[PDB]
Amino acid sequence: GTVNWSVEDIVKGINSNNLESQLQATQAARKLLSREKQPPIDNIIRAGLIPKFVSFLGKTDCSPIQFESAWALTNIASGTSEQTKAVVDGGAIPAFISLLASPHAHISEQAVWALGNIAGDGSAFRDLVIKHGAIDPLLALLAVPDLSTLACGYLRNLTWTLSNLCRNKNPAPPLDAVEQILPTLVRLLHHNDPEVLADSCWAISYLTDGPNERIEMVVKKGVVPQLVKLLGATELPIVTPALRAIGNIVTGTDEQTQKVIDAGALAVFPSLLTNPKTNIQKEATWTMSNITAGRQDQIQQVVNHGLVPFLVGVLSKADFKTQKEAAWAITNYTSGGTVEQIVYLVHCGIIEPLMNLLSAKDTKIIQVILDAISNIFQAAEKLGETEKLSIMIEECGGLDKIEALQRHENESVYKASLNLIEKYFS
């Protein structure tokens, strides 16, 4: 019937003065555009069909053509920035916002989907969708006593579009829009569907990626305990965004990191720092590094949870990026920690893996490791352990690596290695 039409026949049908022929041609276009194998988006655009689809969006007495045109425009807007721009130039944003209030659930869902693609293009189209007033009807669609009564796919699409309205930076979403959206986000964050939870955590991670004031906007709503709970979840698509959000939060002030700590997040890190997924380990070590850069009582809480041995393990064996994050965490620990805490760090066996990592070509990790060693040597000086630590470094082959670093391109590597040799190895 409407299967495998040529764009020529689609154009012929849409250009006819017969609403039913137009509907048939629009469904044929939808079926062309809904195939995985290279949907002919550019051919549909060149045929000048976008204005006709946008006009069909507003045919209230023919809901099927509304639905078909909405689906076609959704799939067109799902492509490159230029194709999304072609959709937007046709005036589709206000038409989709108007359709959000359609009495037909599938049409409003398709409008949500299209607006999600448009906003997900980037900052400019996101803020334009916002300026057209989509947030109010979007949130109204979710204003029900129990989210469970809503259709699953409908709720998932709503959550995804909202997350896209929270996404992207330079600029970040408007403050008032974020405040308007956040309560519904908090509610979605307690929903039971895995996809809704994952997309809500992704939205929260978007919103926490910025100045401490944005992190505060999010943290004030009291979502950190729920974020930790989800950090403990079994579904990787949930743990990943929850961990990203927690990391972004701990990049803020020490009080926000303390809010993360009080929720019990550290107890989850024995598994996260041994998670078989590389990215989970990497981001968990990055979070730990941003935690060890905090106050001394927070370093002490890291110690009490037995996470220093796990940092040693990650530093000993892990993907190289995770090892970079571990080196950064150790350097922050040693720069901000007490003498007792640095001595404990040494007692857990950090020296040997820290030295083994000095043979890597990455110059910045070498600088980081040398800074950590300098801090440890200061802590030892304060106790008179300088010689004992020097002997330990000699026994594991670290002295050879430092002596080799003396003749290194980077000025700071040069100078720091030479200074270590001159000050602690006579």
Partner: peptide
């Protein structure tokens, strides 16, 4: 990050 956009496929 996850997909910015997604088409409705059938």
């Amino acid at each position: 990050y996850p997909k910015k956009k997604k088409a409705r496929i059938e």
